[PDB]
Amino acid sequence: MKVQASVKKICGSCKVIRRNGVIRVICSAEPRHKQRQG
Amino acid sequence: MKTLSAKPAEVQHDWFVVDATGKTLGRLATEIARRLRGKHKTSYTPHVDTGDYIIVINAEQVQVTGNKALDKKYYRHTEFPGGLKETNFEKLVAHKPEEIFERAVKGMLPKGPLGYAMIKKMKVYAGSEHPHAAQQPQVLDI
Amino acid sequence: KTIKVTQTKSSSHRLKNHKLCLQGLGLRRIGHTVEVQDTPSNRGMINKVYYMVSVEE
Amino acid sequence: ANFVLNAQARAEDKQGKGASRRLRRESLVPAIIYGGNAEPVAVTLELRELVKALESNVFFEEVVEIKVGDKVENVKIQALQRHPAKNTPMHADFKRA
Amino acid sequence: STKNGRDSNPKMLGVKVYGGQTVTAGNIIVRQRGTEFHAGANVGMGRDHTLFATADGVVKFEVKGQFGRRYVKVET
Amino acid sequence: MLQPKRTKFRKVHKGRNTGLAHRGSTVSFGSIAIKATERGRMTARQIEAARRTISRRIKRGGKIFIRVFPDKPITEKPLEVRMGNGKGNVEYWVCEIKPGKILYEIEGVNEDLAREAFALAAAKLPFKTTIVTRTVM
RNA sequence: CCCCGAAAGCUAUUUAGGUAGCGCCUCGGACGAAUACCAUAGGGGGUAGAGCACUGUUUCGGCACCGAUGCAAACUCCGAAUACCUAUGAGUACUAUCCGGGAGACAGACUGCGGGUGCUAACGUCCGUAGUCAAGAGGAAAACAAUCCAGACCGCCAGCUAAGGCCCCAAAAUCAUAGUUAAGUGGGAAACGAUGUGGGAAGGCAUAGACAGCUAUAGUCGAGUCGGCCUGCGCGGAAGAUGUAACGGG
Ligand SMILES: [Zn+2]
Known about the structure:
part of a larger assembly; 6 chains; C: alpha+beta; 2 helices; D: alpha/beta; RNA-binding; ribonucleoprotein (chain E)
């Protein structure tokens, strides 16, 4: 999990979602692309 | 000396009962404080207690809006170093419903001996029963 | 041919020429009303202190 | 014919700095029309219509028509002013053709 | 330590009498380092380019001549 | 590090930065350009960094026009020095930026590559920018 | 007890926390429109802005010059608003000026505007200009010389308003009509990031059937869908020491 002020899609398998007022990125292929804005 | 002050020996206190089911906390508290202080009587005097007795029933059914059920915080300090204690509304309403009303009405009454005397006239009960049948309270819808 | 001017605000902190314009029109206090001739010379003083007078034209 | 702009007269009480700023706050554009044998005429234009016309390239080389009610003028674009930072058109000149 | 910190005393130059005013003979009209204004009728020039009136009258400024020089004169 | 070859004076007053840029706000040399939207100061190092980024991205396939030059010197005190005792020493050179001023122009590339290079460059600058293209008027 | 009422500036000083002349206060005498505010008329300027004609400086081409393109406290082909000087004039006002008796003061402060210096730091320092304090009480900003409103002769258990306000502490609307926000945002903070929601101007494809999903572009279905620009209000970025402690509290 990466925690940064800027979160973006990396590949075509990343999806940007919103949970409980937090913007996250979840990737279907590689777990290392997982991100959380913070 | 033509404007007269109310005489404490001539003040009549009346008994009312209020049901708190589904009411907003602060908007009920303002009216309760008004009637405790006596602002609704034409003989109102700032240095004399002229208010009425208010019984509150179903105290654990009071409501708050937004996210205040989980996010509103209650603090106290035991005067030992590091002694700050914290709770929230939803635990406090389950545990001690009367202290919520005590805090809310105490914040709106004056701070002094007269205010301490005024707040003695409010009786808060969690359930739907009160032990003051002998005083024959009247139903008040505020 | 004559107009009525009423002072509506205080003149204590104003500029010196503005105070002198009020004194030259004859206004002495808040709520004072005077009646003056309708001439360009009077109109200049009125227009300079427009923001604290009321004109009944 | 192909390019037509509906316009309304801009009067003396609508001319000036504050008046022009109020017009632009109402989303309008001031314009002037001058040319041979007639006095200048001041008019007001629609911002969206002007932007749509400026997007096309033939607008700058073809005779355009400005209609203020019954009065009709045939003119060419002569000069345009834009805001330095936002690029919004601010004033237009039209030379009679 | 700075090498600056000097300046000279003020000299009080400029126009002393403006257009439309009345003068008497001897009144100084302009103080000037160079000849920014030139002497017209009834106006004399001193050794330091000062312009003064040589007769009573009214001061008047103008622009005249083939070089566009500024002139001041006195009308009696 | 752009800097004038010689100057008439060494130290200049601070001044104030006011107004808009009515001059230098039109694409003249190239076809696409980047321009500032708010005011500020631009240093020679910032100019060099943005130029290097643009040139590296476009791989020197077109021509880059730089329209800002840092002709204003800025002084500083030597540190641990008290107030007074003269003006400081020149440290670096800046250019004053007003809203609407065009910084860089590019000639001879595709718009997608020019925009990607401009986006790369805009991250090195201390003020907001925007992209413009040439127009008849 | 009654009346008026400053200054913390300039110049010089073995002078810098002293003093002297002038400026500012007061009292007496002389003399009244010679004074000021505003209108009209006359007048010089080189600042703001702007520009490249000079002095410097700047980028790209062509051949120091030529074509485009920028910059300047000690550059100017230009050039205001205000300020300043003079004359005439209505109205309002104990105004102006001259001669004498007595002084105090010559450590200022903050706020706004134009600037130098400093880091476009400081409740920093040095100038110009206006207001307040100094020497000024009352109401508002929780408390708060210098901010906002307003200038206290004395008395009244009368009335109208200013700034600021009208749920309770605590005087007055739980007033009325339309919208926005879900963050207790309101009631601290940036670059940047994001299908959060409201509004606006255009564009692409589409019931000879559009987007997604699914079967190997066709094909099952049955109306919208797609990607940008401008804009209102919100979200993250956001860590500190005694006690909630960044709406005065409820
Ligand atoms: Zn991925």
